[PDB]
Ligand SMILES: C[N+](C)(C)CCO
């Protein structure tokens with residue numbers, strides 16, 4: 730009955746948006762193991778942009794999140810069929826379609842982001858006292 | 860065997876320091892229920908200073924933290940013996956001694972903060988790119 734879900738991401742400066750997304754992945758089925766992959770500093774910088782926290786800081790924060798059962802840190806940047814078999818993953822949960830092969834296989838589960846609840850959004854709020 | 864631990868706080872812009880403190884309270888005994896009290900916006904402002912996030916935002920974030928079993932939100936500003944009996948609390952976990960009566964009763968458990976890992980510390984890091 731237990732279903733293995735994989736979610737990957739940067740998880741820089743973890744906020745409520747991240748946490749709700751993790752909750753959503755965790756609750757996709759009645760009985761789940763949520764594995765979370767945390768991307769490397771170098772690959773994140775190269776492919777995505779700047780990152781504030783190190784891999785160690787981003788991983789250690791995630792350890793405290795209720796929905797997270799296992800962490801793969803660092804995780805590969807690109808998910809492969811080999812990776813799914815290596816970790817016995819049943820579904821990939823995520824927000825030229827990179828995920829097309831996952832959808833064809835029936836292994837893709839959509840989750841959603843939450844806007845306006847960002848870490849950076851809170852500084853904007855602090856500054857509107859001046 | 861189950862021991863009820865109470866920790867209260869503001870938990871504004873929750874960071875790794877908060878989370879480690881919650882972990883420490885949760886792990887004080889083998890079998891615990893950690894109840895976390897979240898202080899009101901008005902009492903926090905009056906007695907302590909500015910707060911960035913609302914009670915709702917601070918409470919909702921805490922819901923996602925692994926170590927948190929129950930939340931009292933808002934919680935009273937000052938812990939009383941009546942409150943301990945109301946919620947059947949065995950120990951109060953915290954960082955003119957306000958907590959002297961708790962120590963005399965054998966109901967006080969010390970925990971520790973973590974410095975330099977603050978939310979605000981991370982903005983300082985972002986700005987040292989300019
Ligand atoms: C979205 N990718 C899987 C390509 C990178 C990690 O988030």
Ligand SMILES: C[N+](C)(C)CCO
Pocket residue numbers: 867868869898936937938957
């Ligand atoms: C420390 N007090 C209990 C007085 C307020 C909440 O943190």
